[PDB]
Design a protein around this motif. Structure first.
Motif, PDB file in Angstrom:
ATOM      1  N   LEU C  37       0.865  -1.296  -0.084  1.00 34.77           N
ATOM      2  CA  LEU C  37       0.032   0.038   0.030  1.00 34.77           C
ATOM      3  C   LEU C  37       0.829   0.988   0.044  1.00 34.77           C
ATOM      4  O   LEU C  37       0.465   2.246  -0.513  1.00 34.77           O
ATOM      5  CB  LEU C  37      -0.692   0.032   1.275  1.00 34.77           C
ATOM      6  N   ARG C  38       1.869   1.243   0.678  1.00 34.19           N
ATOM      7  CA  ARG C  38       2.917   2.474   0.534  1.00 34.19           C
ATOM      8  C   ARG C  38       3.126   2.831  -0.926  1.00 34.19           C
ATOM      9  O   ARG C  38       3.362   3.686  -1.310  1.00 34.19           O
ATOM     10  CB  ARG C  38       4.435   1.982   1.132  1.00 34.19           C
ATOM     11  N   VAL C  39       3.427   1.952  -1.717  1.00 35.93           N
ATOM     12  CA  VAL C  39       4.187   2.014  -3.202  1.00 35.93           C
ATOM     13  C   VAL C  39       3.149   2.842  -3.995  1.00 35.93           C
ATOM     14  O   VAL C  39       3.453   4.113  -4.566  1.00 35.93           O
ATOM     15  CB  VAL C  39       4.441   0.801  -3.875  1.00 35.93           C
ATOM     16  N   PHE C  49      -4.314   5.678   3.109  1.00 37.76           N
ATOM     17  CA  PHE C  49      -4.542   4.474   3.509  1.00 37.76           C
ATOM     18  C   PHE C  49      -3.837   4.134   5.091  1.00 37.76           C
ATOM     19  O   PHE C  49      -2.916   4.650   5.376  1.00 37.76           O
ATOM     20  CB  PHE C  49      -3.951   3.032   2.663  1.00 37.76           C
ATOM     21  N   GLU C  50      -4.627   3.295   5.711  1.00 36.37           N
ATOM     22  CA  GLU C  50      -4.337   3.115   7.280  1.00 36.37           C
ATOM     23  C   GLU C  50      -4.554   1.751   7.715  1.00 36.37           C
ATOM     24  O   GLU C  50      -5.424   1.149   7.259  1.00 36.37           O
ATOM     25  CB  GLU C  50      -4.878   4.281   8.081  1.00 36.37           C
ATOM     26  N   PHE C  51      -4.213   1.436   9.041  1.00 33.94           N
ATOM     27  CA  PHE C  51      -4.360   0.049   9.320  1.00 33.94           C
ATOM     28  C   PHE C  51      -5.392   0.271  10.768  1.00 33.94           C
ATOM     29  O   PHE C  51      -5.208   1.338  11.435  1.00 33.94           O
ATOM     30  CB  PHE C  51      -3.043  -0.339   9.918  1.00 33.94           C
ATOM     31  N   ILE C  52      -6.346  -0.603  11.040  1.00 35.05           N
ATOM     32  CA  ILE C  52      -7.076  -0.643  12.049  1.00 35.05           C
ATOM     33  C   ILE C  52      -6.863  -1.675  12.772  1.00 35.05           C
ATOM     34  O   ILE C  52      -7.157  -2.975  12.306  1.00 35.05           O
ATOM     35  CB  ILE C  52      -8.418  -0.653  11.777  1.00 35.05           C
ATOM     36  N   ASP C  53      -6.514  -1.863  14.144  1.00 35.61           N
ATOM     37  CA  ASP C  53      -6.259  -2.984  14.905  1.00 35.61           C
ATOM     38  C   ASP C  53      -7.555  -3.530  15.415  1.00 35.61           C
ATOM     39  O   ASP C  53      -8.176  -3.055  16.535  1.00 35.61           O
ATOM     40  CB  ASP C  53      -5.343  -2.441  16.240  1.00 35.61           C
ATOM     41  N   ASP C  54      -8.045  -4.527  14.751  1.00 28.17           N
ATOM     42  CA  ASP C  54      -9.269  -5.271  14.777  1.00 28.17           C
ATOM     43  C   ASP C  54      -9.065  -6.038  16.232  1.00 28.17           C
ATOM     44  O   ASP C  54     -10.157  -5.917  17.042  1.00 28.17           O
ATOM     45  CB  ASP C  54      -9.613  -6.136  13.603  1.00 28.17           C
ATOM     46  N   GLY C  55      -8.233  -6.887  16.100  1.00 27.75           N
ATOM     47  CA  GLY C  55      -8.082  -7.934  17.329  1.00 27.75           C
ATOM     48  C   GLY C  55      -7.950  -9.438  16.999  1.00 27.75           C
ATOM     49  O   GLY C  55      -7.617 -10.130  17.671  1.00 27.75           O
ATOM     50  N   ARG C  56      -8.076  -9.661  15.467  1.00 24.35           N
ATOM     51  CA  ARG C  56      -7.868 -11.007  14.936  1.00 24.35           C
ATOM     52  C   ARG C  56      -6.517 -10.883  14.083  1.00 24.35           C
ATOM     53  O   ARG C  56      -5.915 -11.615  14.285  1.00 24.35           O
ATOM     54  CB  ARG C  56      -9.113 -11.419  14.650  1.00 24.35           C
ATOM     55  N   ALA C  57      -6.816 -10.110  13.275  1.00 29.48           N
ATOM     56  CA  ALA C  57      -5.796  -9.820  11.997  1.00 29.48           C
ATOM     57  C   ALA C  57      -5.569  -8.560  11.446  1.00 29.48           C
ATOM     58  O   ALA C  57      -4.751  -8.410  10.658  1.00 29.48           O
ATOM     59  CB  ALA C  57      -5.986 -10.754  10.831  1.00 29.48           C
ATOM     60  N   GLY C  58      -6.389  -7.566  12.108  1.00 29.02           N
ATOM     61  CA  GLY C  58      -6.231  -6.358  11.719  1.00 29.02           C
ATOM     62  C   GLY C  58      -6.794  -5.894  10.361  1.00 29.02           C
ATOM     63  O   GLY C  58      -7.157  -6.986   9.415  1.00 29.02           O
ATOM     64  N   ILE C 102       5.227  -4.257  -8.647  1.00 31.38           N
ATOM     65  CA  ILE C 102       5.687  -4.342  -7.274  1.00 31.38           C
ATOM     66  C   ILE C 102       6.772  -5.537  -7.404  1.00 31.38           C
ATOM     67  O   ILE C 102       6.490  -6.518  -8.004  1.00 31.38           O
ATOM     68  CB  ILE C 102       4.652  -4.412  -6.431  1.00 31.38           C
ATOM     69  N   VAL C 103       7.906  -5.357  -6.796  1.00 28.13           N
ATOM     70  CA  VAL C 103       9.038  -6.254  -6.806  1.00 28.13           C
ATOM     71  C   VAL C 103       9.313  -6.281  -5.265  1.00 28.13           C
ATOM     72  O   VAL C 103       9.571  -5.344  -4.464  1.00 28.13           O
ATOM     73  CB  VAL C 103      10.112  -6.035  -7.579  1.00 28.13           C
ATOM     74  N   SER C 104       9.697  -7.506  -4.674  1.00 28.39           N
ATOM     75  CA  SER C 104      10.115  -7.793  -3.409  1.00 28.39           C
ATOM     76  C   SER C 104      11.603  -8.060  -3.544  1.00 28.39           C
ATOM     77  O   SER C 104      12.082  -9.486  -3.720  1.00 28.39           O
ATOM     78  CB  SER C 104       9.568  -8.681  -2.469  1.00 28.39           C
ATOM     79  N   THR C 105      12.526  -7.019  -3.541  1.00 25.51           N
ATOM     80  CA  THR C 105      13.927  -7.122  -3.627  1.00 25.51           C
ATOM     81  C   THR C 105      14.436  -7.500  -2.218  1.00 25.51           C
ATOM     82  O   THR C 105      13.843  -7.562  -1.299  1.00 25.51           O
ATOM     83  CB  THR C 105      14.474  -6.070  -4.270  1.00 25.51           C
ATOM     84  N   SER C 106      16.104  -7.699  -2.321  1.00 22.53           N
ATOM     85  CA  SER C 106      16.673  -7.754  -1.059  1.00 22.53           C
ATOM     86  C   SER C 106      16.410  -6.629   0.011  1.00 22.53           C
ATOM     87  O   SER C 106      16.677  -6.790   1.019  1.00 22.53           O
ATOM     88  CB  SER C 106      18.116  -8.000  -1.454  1.00 22.53           C
ATOM     89  N   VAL C 109       9.876  -4.406  -0.301  1.00 24.15           N
ATOM     90  CA  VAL C 109       8.807  -4.210  -1.177  1.00 24.15           C
ATOM     91  C   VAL C 109       8.853  -2.628  -1.673  1.00 24.15           C
ATOM     92  O   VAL C 109       8.840  -2.005  -0.974  1.00 24.15           O
ATOM     93  CB  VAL C 109       7.354  -4.408  -0.595  1.00 24.15           C
ATOM     94  N   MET C 110       8.778  -2.384  -3.026  1.00 26.06           N
ATOM     95  CA  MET C 110       9.082  -1.175  -3.550  1.00 26.06           C
ATOM     96  C   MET C 110       8.767  -1.253  -5.106  1.00 26.06           C
ATOM     97  O   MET C 110       8.767  -2.337  -5.544  1.00 26.06           O
ATOM     98  CB  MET C 110      10.309  -0.787  -3.145  1.00 26.06           C
ATOM     99  N   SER C 111       8.504  -0.102  -5.570  1.00 22.93           N
ATOM    100  CA  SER C 111       8.044  -0.010  -6.914  1.00 22.93           C
ATOM    101  C   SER C 111       8.998  -0.317  -7.915  1.00 22.93           C
ATOM    102  O   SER C 111      10.243  -0.433  -7.627  1.00 22.93           O
ATOM    103  CB  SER C 111       7.579   1.688  -7.106  1.00 22.93           C
ATOM    104  N   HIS C 112       8.795  -0.489  -9.233  1.00 21.54           N
ATOM    105  CA  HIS C 112       9.565  -1.209  -9.878  1.00 21.54           C
ATOM    106  C   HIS C 112      10.517   0.089 -10.816  1.00 21.54           C
ATOM    107  O   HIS C 112      11.899  -0.177 -10.884  1.00 21.54           O
ATOM    108  CB  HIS C 112       9.133  -2.135 -11.355  1.00 21.54           C
TER     109      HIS C 112
END
Lengths: 61, 155, 129, 227, 60, 197
Positions: C37-39, C49-58, C102-106, C109-112
Motif C-alpha cells: 500500500l505504500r508504493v 491508507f491506514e491500519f485498524i487494529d481489529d483484534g484478530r488480524a487487523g 511491485i517487486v520484493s527485492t533484497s 517491497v517497492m516500486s519497479h
RNA sequence: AGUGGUGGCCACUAUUAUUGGGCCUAAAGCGGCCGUAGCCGGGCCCGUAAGUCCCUGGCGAAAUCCCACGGCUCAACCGUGGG
RNA sequence: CCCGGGUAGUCCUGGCUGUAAAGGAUGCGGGCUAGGUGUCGGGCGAGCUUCGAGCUCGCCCGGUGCCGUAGGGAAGCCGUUAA
C-alpha cells in the motif's frame, strides 16, 4: 455486517433474592445458574438470552 | 462445519477485542487456578469448566489473564491443569470422539443394516485419524501410538 | 479456504472501484499488504491508507481516488533480474512506462521504477495501471 | 479548405434548426466540434456536424465498407433488402460508422452515410510504443481492448511508418481516424465484417475511457481530437 | 497550427472523465448555486451521492 | 422553520408511505409502524423542497416541462405548469416526445419533473436520450436510479400531491421574485387537487 | 531467367492454449462421498540463508549471427575491432 | 396399439450385478461485486395475545424460488443459490 465483530452477550452483576449473594453471570448461560450459598436457580439457559430470576443490579460489557 | 456437510452455517460466537482483563472482575489470578482445579478434581473437562466459569462465576476468559509463571504466555485452563498434574494425556477433544466411535460401533453391531450410521462412522473415524496424524506431527502423542478399535474398547 | 491475502486484496480494490465506491476495507491485513500500500500511494493512485487494529488480524482502510484501471497480484512470483525487465512490462501494462509493478527485492517491497536505478532484481509481486 | 467553408455557409443558410442543439450551432456560439461531446447532448440532425466539420462530405473522408443483401420472405416470394455498412470521418480524430437499410443501392448508401454522421465520436491519439516515444499522436496512446458480439480486438501502439497491420475493415476505419501505425490482434470470427467494424469503433471509443495523468499527456503527446 | 486544448469535464462524485457519448449531466450546485456539478452515467445509474466543491452540501 | 404547518403536512398524508423500502432510500426512513408501513422524515422533505424551490425558478418558465400519468397527479401538474408557466403533459406520455424530432409536440425541456418513477419509465428514458437533469418525487418504494433531485413524499394521496406542487409553485415565484410573501400566495391547496366526481 | 505441379516442415491456429482455449444448450465434469502420495495453505516475532537477488575469479573451442571500418567495382566473401 | 387370460418379475432372508436424460445436462474451497420479493429452521426486538411462537411487523444467520441494476454470453439466457 460490521467490519469488526462485537459480542452481543453482556454480563450481569446480580443480587440474589434469598441469601443476598452478589454474583456475576453471563447473559446467555448454558446451564442453570446456581447461587453459591442458597443454591437456588438464578438464570435459565434458553434458546436466546437466559431468563434471569433474581434482581439485576448492573450490566457489564 | 464444512469439511463434510459443506454447509456454511455460522453458529460461531464473538469475543470482544480485549487485551487486558476486565476491571470489574474481583477474583485474582490465584483464585481462578483454585476454582478450576476444584472443578477439575470433580471430573469436568476444560470446555465445560470454562462454560461454568463464564456462566456462574462470570469470568469472560482465562486467556485474558497473563501467566504469573510465564510473562509471554496467556493463562489457559488446560495449562492450569498441566500445572498441577491434572492435564489429560489424551486431549479431551479426541477422547470424546473415541468414546463416541466406540458406542456407535456397538450400535452398528446390534444393527448391521443401517448404512447411514455406517457412513457416519466412516467420517468420524476420518476425523479421529486426522487429529491423530496432527498430534503425531506435533508430538503430543507417542509415535508408535495408533488407534485400534480393540484397544479403543479399553479406553 | 483462504490462500493468499494479497491477490484477494487487489481483486477487492479493483472490483470495489469498478462500481466506484469511496472507502474500501480489506479484512486479511498483514505487513506485506502495508508495504504494498505504500508504493502506489507514493505514486498517488490511492488516497490515505491506514491500519485498524481489529483484534484478530487487523483491517486495512483505503480511500479510492478513482485513478486505477486494473490492479492485480501476479501469483507465481516470477524472479526477474534487471536487464530483462522489459520482457515483463509487455505482459502487464498497456503502454510504454504506463503504470507500475511491485517487486520484493533484497531491500524490501517497492516500486519497479525505483528499482531500475537502484539496480536490483527480485520477484514480481503485483501490478497496477 | 475554403470550399468547405463555402459549403458550411451554404448549409447554414438552407438548414433550419429543429432539435435544441440546432440553435447554438446555427446562432454560432458553438464553433468547436468537441463542444458537442464534452457536455453530452444528443445529435439527431445531420446538419449539426457538417457546419463544424464539413470535411465529412469529401469522397476520401467517406467509405462504403460492405453491401449485405438480406432476404425477408413470405408465402408469395423472397423480398430482398439492402443493408450497407459505411463509415465517414475527418482524418483528425472524428469518425462515425453507420448501417443503412434500403430497397436500392443508392438509398441504402444515403441512409447509411446519414446515420454514420450521427455516430461521430472523439478519438484520443498518442504515441505509446516502446520504440517510438516521439510524443506525436501518430498512433494510439496506449494498448486498448474492444468487444462486440464474439469479436474482440486488441490495438497495441506501434512505431512510426509501420502502417496499419490489421484487417481491411479496421484498416479503413483507422485510416479515417487519423492513425497510421498499430499492431492488431483479433479474437473470434473476423469474417463477419459488421461485428469487426463495430468492435474497432468501440475500441477507439474506449481509448477515451482510460484514466490519464498529465505526465503521460506530455510523455505521449496525447491529443483529445484535433491535433 | 493552434492546439485547441479544451478542458474535458470531470465528474464530481467519482472523478472519472466524461467520454463523448456518455449520458452524463451538468447542473448548478444545490446549496451554493454557483458551482457546476457533473454526474457521469456510471455515477448516475447507481445514484451514488455527490458532494459540492464549494459549500460541502451532500445530495443524490 | 417550515414553509407550511407541520400538522397540515401530516393531514396531507405526505409522511404516510407504503409497506415497502429500498436500500438507496434508507436514509430518508423515519420508522416502520407495527403493521409494516414505512414512514418518511418530514424534516428532510422540507429541506429537499426548499432546495427544489431554489432550483426550479432559476430556469426559464417556458423551457420547464412536467409530466404525470397517475390519475391523482394529472390536475396538480396542470395547475403547477399554469402557475409557473411550465409546460405540462398529463396522462400517457407519448413515445418519441423529445426523442423524435418529427413529432408535432417535439419539446425539449432543460429540466423534467417526475411524479412516480414507476409510472413513466418512458419519460425518463427519453429524457436520458437527450441528456438533461432530473427531479423526482420518490415514495418509499421508488428506485433512485437517475435521480439528480429526489424529494421524499407520498405520491399516491391526492391531498399530498396537490400540496407538494402548491408549495413548489410558491417557492418558484419566491425565487423568481414575482411573488414576495406567503400571504401573497392566495391560490388555495384545493385548487391543485383532483376533484372526485 | 525464371516459371508451374507434387510431396515433407513452420506460420496461418488462442485447432495444443506457460504467455493463451473451452466443458448448461455446439465433442467435452465421472451418479455420490471418503482418503494416501503429490500440489496449494492463516497472522506476528526471533534465528538460518537453501532457493531468491547484486558484485566478483575461473569456464562454455572454432564455425555461424549482429554492427563499424578496411580489401577485392560494390555485393556475397575475407580480415581488424565490439557484442 | 384395444380387450380377455397368463409364467419370470414385482414381496421377505442371504449374495451377486455397479448400471440410467443417476440432469441443475452446471467438479469442489475461499474472497469481492445494485437491489426487490415468500415460505422453512433457529435467534432477537416490538405489538396482538381467550396467554398455547398462539397470532402480526422489522432485523441476523442457514437452506430454499421468482424478478432484476451492472456485467457476461453467438444467442437461448445467467445474473450473490452466477454461466
Amino acid at each position: 455486517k460490521p467490519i469488526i465483530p462485537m459480542p452481543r452477550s453482556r454480563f450481569l452483576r446480580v443480587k440474589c433474592i434469598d441469601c443476598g449473594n452478589e454474583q456475576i453471570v453471563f447473559s446467555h448461560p448454558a446451564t442453570k445458574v446456581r447461587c453459591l450459598i442458597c443454591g437456588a436457580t438464578l438464570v435459565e439457559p434458553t434458546g436466546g438470552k437466559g431468563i434471569v430470576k433474581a434482581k439485576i443490579l448492573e450490566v457489564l460489557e | 462445519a464444512r469439511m463434510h456437510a459443506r454447509k456454511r452455517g455460522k453458529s460461531g460466537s464473538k469475543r470482544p477485542p480485549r487485551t487486558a482483563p476486565p476491571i470489574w472482575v474481583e477474583y485474582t489470578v490465584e483464585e481462578i487456578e483454585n476454582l478450576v482445579v476444584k472443578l477439575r478434581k470433580e471430573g469436568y473437562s476444560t470446555a465445560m469448566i470454562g462454560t461454568i466459569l463464564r456462566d456462574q462465576y462470570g469470568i469472560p476468559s482465562v486467556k485474558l489473564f497473563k501467566d504469573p509463571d510465564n510473562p509471554n504466555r496467556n493463562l489457559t485452563i488446560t495449562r492450569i491443569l498441566e500445572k498441577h498434574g491434572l492435564a489429560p494425556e489424551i486431549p479431551e477433544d479426541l477422547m470424546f470422539l473415541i468414546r463416541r466411535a466406540v458406542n456407535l460401533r456397538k450400535h452398528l453391531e446390534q444393527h448391521p443394516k443401517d448404512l447411514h450410521s455406517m457412513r457416519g462412522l466412516q467420517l468420524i473415524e476420518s476425523k479421529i485419524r486426522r487429529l491423530v496424524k496432527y498430534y503425531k506431527r506435533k508430538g503430543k502423542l507417542p509415535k508408535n501410538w495408533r488407534y485400534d478399535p480393540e484397544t479403543a474398547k479399553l479406553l | 479456504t483462504l490462500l493468499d491475502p494479497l491477490a484477494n486484496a487487489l481483486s477487492h480494490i479493483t472490483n470495489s472501484e469498478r462500481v466506484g465506491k469511496r472507502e474500501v476495507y480489506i479484512k486479511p491485513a498483514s505487513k506485506l499488504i502495508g508495504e504494498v500500500l505504500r508504493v502506489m500511494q507514493k505514486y498517488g493512485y490511492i488516497g490515505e491508507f491506514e491500519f485498524i487494529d481489529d483484534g484478530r488480524a487487523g483491517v486495512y482502510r483505503v480511500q479510492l481516488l478513482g485513478r486505477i484501471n486494473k490492479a492485480g497480484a501476479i501469483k507465481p512470483r516470477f524472479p526477474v533480474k534487471v536487464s530483462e525487465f522489459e520482457k515483463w512490462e509487455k505482459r502487464f501494462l498497456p503502454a510504454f512506462e504506463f503504470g507500475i509493478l511491485i517487486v520484493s527485492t533484497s531491500q524490501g517491497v517497492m516500486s519497479h521504477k525505483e528499482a531500475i536505478e537502484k539496480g536490483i532484481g527480485g520477484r514480481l509481486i503485483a501490478y497496477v495501471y | 479548405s475554403q470550399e468547405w467553408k463555402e459549403y458550411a455557409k451554404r448549409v447554414l443558410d438552407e438548414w433550419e434548426p429543429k432539435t435544441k442543439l440546432g440553435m447554438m450551432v446555427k446562432e454560432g456560439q458553438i464553433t468547436d466540434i468537441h463542444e458537442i461531446f464534452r457536455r453530452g447532448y444528443q445529435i439527431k440532425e445531420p446538419e449539426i456536424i457538417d457546419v463544424l466539420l464539413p470535411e465529412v462530405n469529401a469522397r476520401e473522408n467517406q467509405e462504403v465498407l460492405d453491401i449485405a443483401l438480406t432476404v425477408r420472405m413470405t408465402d408469395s416470394g423472397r423480398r430482398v433488402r439492402f443493408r450497407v455498412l459505411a463509415a465517414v470521418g475527418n482524418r483528425d480524430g472524428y469518425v462515425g460508422l453507420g448501417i443503412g437499410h434500403g430497397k436500392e443501392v443508392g438509398i441504402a448508401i444515403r441512409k447509411a452515410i446519414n446515420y454514420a454522421k450521427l455516430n461521430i465520436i472523439e478519438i484520443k491519439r498518442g504515441c505509446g510504443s516502446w520504440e517510438c516515444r516521439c510524443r506525436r499522436p501518430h498512433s494510439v496512446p496506449f494498448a486498448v481492448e474492444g468487444k462486440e458480439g464474439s469479436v474482440r480486438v486488441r490495438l497495441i501502439p506501434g512505431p512510426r511508418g509501420l502502417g496499419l497491420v490489421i484487417g481491411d475493415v479496421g484498416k479503413k476505419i483507422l485510416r479515417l481516424a487519423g492513425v497510421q501505425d498499430v499492431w492488431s490482434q483479433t479474437f473470434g470470427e473476423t469474417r463477419t465484417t459488421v461485428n469487426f467494424a463495430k468492435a474497432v469503433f468501440n475500441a477507439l471509443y474506449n481509448t477515451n475511457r482510460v484514466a490519464i495523468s498529465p505526465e503521460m499527456i506530455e510523455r505521449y503527446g496525447i491529443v483529445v481530437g484535433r491535433a | 497550427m493552434v492546439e485547441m486544448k479544451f478542458e474535458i469535464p470531470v465528474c464530481t462524485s467519482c472523478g472519472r472523465e466524461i467520454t463523448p457519448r456518455e449520458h452524463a449531466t451538468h447542473f448548478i450546485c444545490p446549496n451554493c448555486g454557483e458551482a457546476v456539478i457533473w454526474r457521469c452515467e456510471s455515477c448516475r445509474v447507481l445514484a451514488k451521492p455527490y458532494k459540492c466543491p464549494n459549500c460541502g452540501w451532500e445530495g443524490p | 422553520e417550515y414553509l407550511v404547518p407541520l400538522d397540515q403536512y401530516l393531514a396531507a398524508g405526505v409522511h404516510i408511505g407504503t409497506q415497502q423500502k429500498t436500500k438507496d432510500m434508507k436514509k430518508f426512513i423515519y420508522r416502520v409502524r407495527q403493521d409494516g408501513l414505512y414512514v418518511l422524515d418530514v424534516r428532510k422533505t422540507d429541506e429537499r423542497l426548499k432546495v427544489a424551490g431554489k432550483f426550479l425558478a432559476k430556469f426559464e418558465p417556458q423551457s420547464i416541462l412536467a409530466v404525470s400519468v397517475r390519475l391523482y397527479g394529472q390536475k396538480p401538474v396542470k395547475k403547477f405548469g399554469e402557475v409557473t408557466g411550465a409546460r405540462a403533459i398529463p396522462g400517457r406520455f407519448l413515445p418519441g416526445t423529445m426523442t423524435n424530432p418529427a413529432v408535432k409536440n417535439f419539446f425539449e425541456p432543460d429540466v423534467l419533473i417526475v411524479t412516480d418513477p414507476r409510472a413513466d419509465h418512458q419519460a425518463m428514458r427519453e429524457a436520458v436520450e437527450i441528456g438533461i437533469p432530473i427531479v423526482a418525487l420518490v415514495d418509499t418504494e421508488n428506485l433512485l436510479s437517475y435521480v439528480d433531485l429526489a424529494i421524499p413524499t407520498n405520491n399516491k394521496g391526492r391531498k399530498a400531491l396537490a400540496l407538494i406542487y402548491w408549495i413548489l409553485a410558491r417557492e418558484i415565484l419566491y425565487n423568481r421574485g414575482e411573488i414576495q410573501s406567503r400571504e401573497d400566495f392566495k391560490i388555495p391547496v384545493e385548487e391543485f387537487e383532483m376533484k372526485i366526481v
